[PDB]
Amino acid sequence: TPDIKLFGKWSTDDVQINDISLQDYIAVKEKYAKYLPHSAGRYAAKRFRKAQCPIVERLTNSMMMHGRNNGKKLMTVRIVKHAFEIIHLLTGENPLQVLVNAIINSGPREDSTRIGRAGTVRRQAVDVSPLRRVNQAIWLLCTGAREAAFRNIKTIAECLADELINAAKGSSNSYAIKKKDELERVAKSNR
Amino acid sequence: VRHVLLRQGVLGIKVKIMLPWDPSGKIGPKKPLPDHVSIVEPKDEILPTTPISEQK
Amino acid sequence: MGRVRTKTVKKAARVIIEKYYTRLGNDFHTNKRVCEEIAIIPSKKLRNKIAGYVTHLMKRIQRGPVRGISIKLQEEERERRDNYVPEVSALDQEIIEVDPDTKEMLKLLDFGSLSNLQVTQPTVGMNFK
Amino acid sequence: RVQPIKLARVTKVLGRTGSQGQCTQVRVEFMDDTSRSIIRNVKGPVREGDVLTLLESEREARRL
Amino acid sequence: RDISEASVFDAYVLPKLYVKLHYCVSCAIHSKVVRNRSREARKDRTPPP
Amino acid sequence: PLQSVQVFGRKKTATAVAHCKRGNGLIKVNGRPLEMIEPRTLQYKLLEPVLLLGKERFAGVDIRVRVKGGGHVAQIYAIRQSISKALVAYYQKYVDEASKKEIKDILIQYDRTLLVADPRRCESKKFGGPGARARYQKSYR
RNA sequence: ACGAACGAGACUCUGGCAUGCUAACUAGUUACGCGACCCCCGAGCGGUCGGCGUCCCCCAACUUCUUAGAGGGACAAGUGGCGUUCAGCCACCCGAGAUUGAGCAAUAACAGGUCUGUGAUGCCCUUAGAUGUCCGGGGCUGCACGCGCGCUACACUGACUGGCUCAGCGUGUGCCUACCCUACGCCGGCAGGCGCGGGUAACCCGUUGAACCCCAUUCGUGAUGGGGAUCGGGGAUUGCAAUUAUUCCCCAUGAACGAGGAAUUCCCAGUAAGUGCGGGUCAUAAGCUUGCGUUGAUUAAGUCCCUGCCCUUUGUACACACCGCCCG
C-alpha cells in the first residue's frame, strides 16, 4: 500500500463509478498498485475474483488473444501503455477514467436465449449481469482493435487509442458500440 | 505364467498365489497388513492412585 | 475441501476410542503423535486421516450423550444414572379420580381404592368417518 | 408503450439452473416501487446488493 | 398486488376461478398429472393436491 | 556468521539466491546492475519494492545474488523473492522485533506473493495430446 | 440379514510449506585472507568503495544455494453457516488447506487384433527349378480424383540485419563385432578440407555464454523486402553405390495464399497456445514420437437442452438383446 500511486507518466488513483450498476466489477484498488501491470492470471480462483480483478490488469492481460501474441508480451504491454499515452495526448485528460466511462457507454444490456415456446427457436431476454456487460465492452473493443489494425494502416496502440477516444467521446464509432444496440434491440423485440 | 504344447495344440496357464508368511520370511512380505489398527496390550489409567508415597 | 472417509479409519477409530480413549488426545497434533507409537499402518496417509477423525471424536466426545461413539465415561454414566433412587412413588401419584364404570367393574372383584368417581360420560361423535 | 429505466437491487438469486444460458432467477426490489415486483432473470455473475441495469421496468421472467 | 396498487377499492375480495379439470389417461401421461408406481405401490394412492 | 543473510528464492523453477550484506548500501542482481537485466519493457518492474520497502532499509544492504534457470521474468521473481527471503531473517533472527515490524508488514503491503512463489510448475506432457491437457484430434472417414 | 473379500480407498513416483536434520579434494562453495595477478575503472585520477567463470599447490573449510536420505505437511483440523450436527460441504486464521499431476492394475466376454515381435503354436502347405539361402537392378516414393493424420502462413503485434539481455531434459569409445559425447586454430563463405587434444562421466562439453518476449532499424497497406515453393547453375558429404533433390549451402528461379462454406476435436489453469531445445530410428536422419522448457490468454464454477455411463419404476412375440423378431 504505497505512499504515492503513479505510472511514471500520470496518476493511478482518481478512479470512480459512473453507472452504479457496475460497482465492484471495475476494479482499480483491489489491494495494491504497480509500476505497470503484469500477471499470470492469478485471480483465476473463481468467477468473483475475476469479477473484481483490476481493470488495467484485466485489459493488459486480456489483449493477448489471437494465439502467438501472448508469445510476445513485453512489447504488447509497451503497446498498451503507448495507447494510453496516445489518448492522453490526443484528447488530453487521463485515459484511464475516460476508458472507464467508455466501457460504461459501450456496455451491453441484455442477452436472449433459445427456448422454443411451441418448438420453433425463439429468443428470450435476460438482464446482462454487470460483469458480463463490462467484459463484453472491453473484450469486443479488443475485437475491434484487432479488426482495425488487421485491415487498416494504424498500429495496435493507435487503433486502441482511437477506439477509446470515440467510444465514450463519439456515437456509432466502435464495433462494440454497434454490438450494443444490436443486442439491446434484439432483447426488446425478443423479450 | 506358462504354456503347454500338445499334439492338438497349445494351452495357457496362469497361477496367482498370495505370499504365505505374514512376517518378512523368505517369501514373507512386509510385517504390517494393509488394514485397520488393533490392540496387542493397550493401556488404561483406571486403578485408584491417591496421595501416598514410597521411599527407595 | 476434504472427502468422506473410509472403513480403514472407521475401524481404526472405533477401536482406539474404545480402548485408548482415556489415553487418546484432545486435538489433532496430539492425535497424530499418539498414532505414531500406538498405531501400526504402512503409511502416513492413513495416519493423517486417523488423526483428523480422532479430532472429530473429541469434537463429539463431551458433546452430551452422543450416539456416534462409545467410551467408558458414557457407558458408566448412563448405567449409573439408570442406577436410580425412586422418589416416593409407590402410590405413583397423589389423589386419583376413577370412573363409575371402573367402580362397577371392581364390584365383581368387590374392590375399591382411593376414589372420587370421575365423570366423563357424554360423547360428541367419535372416530372420524 | 413505455420503457421506464430502473436500477434493480437483487434481493436474492435462485441458482444457475433451468435454462442452460448460465441464467439466474432474481427477485429484485427496485429501491423505488412498492407494490410492483417484477421477478426476472439474468445471465452470469450476480450477487445481492448491486442493482442490475434496466432499460424497461417490464421484463418479468418466469418463462413468459 | 399490482392490481391493488392502482385500484378504486383497496383490494377486492377476488372472486376465484373454479374448474373441474379433466384429463384423459394418455394426456395425463403426456402432461404430467401423475406417473407410474411400483408393482405393489400402484395399490396405495396419492393424487396430486 | 552473524552479520549478513544468504538464502534462496525462486519462481516456478528459475532460482536465485540473495545475500543482503552489511556495508554502505548497494544493490546488485546476478552480480550485475539492478535495472540492467534489461527486459527493456519491464524496466519499471524491479524497483517497485526497492522504492516501497523503505529507502532507509535500502541504505545498509549490499545485495549479491547467484542465479540460474528458466526464463527472464521467472528469474525476476526469483530475485524479488530471494531478497525478501534473506532480509526477513536479517531482521528477525540477528535483529530485534521493532526492526522486523515494519518490513514484515510491508511484505503483504506489497503482496504475500513474494515470501513463497507459486506452488505451480509445468508438468510432463501426456501423450495423445500436444501438451499437458489437450488431446490429439479424433478423425473419421 | 450376518460374518466375508476383489474392483475404489490402499499399493508408488513426480511438483510444492522444510531459513532445523544429515556431508562429498571427483561437485559446488570459498561467506573469509580484492591475499597474487587486473584496470585506475570512475567521481576521484590518492585512503578505500566497484568489477575478475583469475589462481589459491592443498595435508583450511561448509552444504545458505546444490543433487537428497530420513525427519516430517494436511486429516473439514478449528471455527462462521446448514443437516438429523450422521457421515460432511463453502469460507477464513495456523497457509501447503483437502485432492499437483503421472502410475499401478478386476470378474463374463467380444470371436475386435496378434501365427508377416518368435524355433509361442495343432493341421495341411514349400521340401532342390524354395515360401530356406548370399547377391545385383527395379518396386514398397509412378498420377486425371477423393480423405485424414500433417509442417508454413495468409503479412504492420508483418518483420529485415546487428547487438545482449536467459536450462534442464538424456545419450556419451568396439557391443550380443563395428564405429562413442565434445572442443582449438589453419583455410573456402556456409556447407566443407586439416591435425593436434578433454572424457567410460556432479571429471569434460556447459556456470549447455538456448530462441521466440527484447530493442536500433526501416518502406508503407503496394501478392507488397511478405506467405516463399517451383525450377535453373554450381559447391562440398556419408555410403559398394543418390540417378525419380536422401540430407546440407549459396547465387538464383519468386509461384499457389488475403484467417477458408460441407462435417468435427481440444482444453475452464504455469492449463490452451507460441514454442527453441533433447531423446528412437543411422553409413544418411524428423514437419513423427515423446519429454525439457520458456512468453504465458477471452469467458466460464452451471447444466443433461446435443451427443453419452450409471440408477429405480416399468412393457416386451426380443434370448446372437431394436442393426432383434416382425407383418401384407
From TrEMBL, chain A:
GO biological process: regulation of translational fidelity; ribosomal small subunit biogenesis; translation
Database matches in InterPro entries: Ribosomal_uS7, Ribosomal_uS7_CS, Ribosomal_uS7_dom, Ribosomal_uS7_dom_sf, Ribosomal_uS7_euk/arc
Family classification: Belongs to the universal ribosomal protein uS7 family.
Organism of this sequence: Oryctolagus cuniculus (Rabbit)
Domain Small ribosomal subunit protein uS7, residue spans: 33-191
SUPFAM superfamilies, A to Z: Ribosomal protein S7
Keywords, comma-separated and alphabetical: Ribonucleoprotein, Ribosomal protein
Cited Gene3D superfamilies: Ribosomal protein S7 domain
Pfam families named among the record's database cross-references: Ribosomal_S7
Function field: Component of the small ribosomal subunit. The ribosome is a large ribonucleoprotein complex responsible for the synthesis of proteins in the cell. Part of the small subunit (SSU) processome, first precursor of the small eukaryotic ribosomal subunit. During the assembly of the SSU processome in the nucleolus, many ribosome biogenesis factors, an RNA chaperone and ribosomal proteins associate with the nascent pre-rRNA and work in concert to generate RNA folding, modifications, rearrangements and cleavage as well as targeted degradation of pre-ribosomal RNA by the RNA exosome.
UniProt key word Cell wall biogenesis/degradation: no
Gene Ontology CC terms: cytosolic small ribosomal subunit; small-subunit processome; synapse
Name of the featured protein: Small ribosomal subunit protein uS7
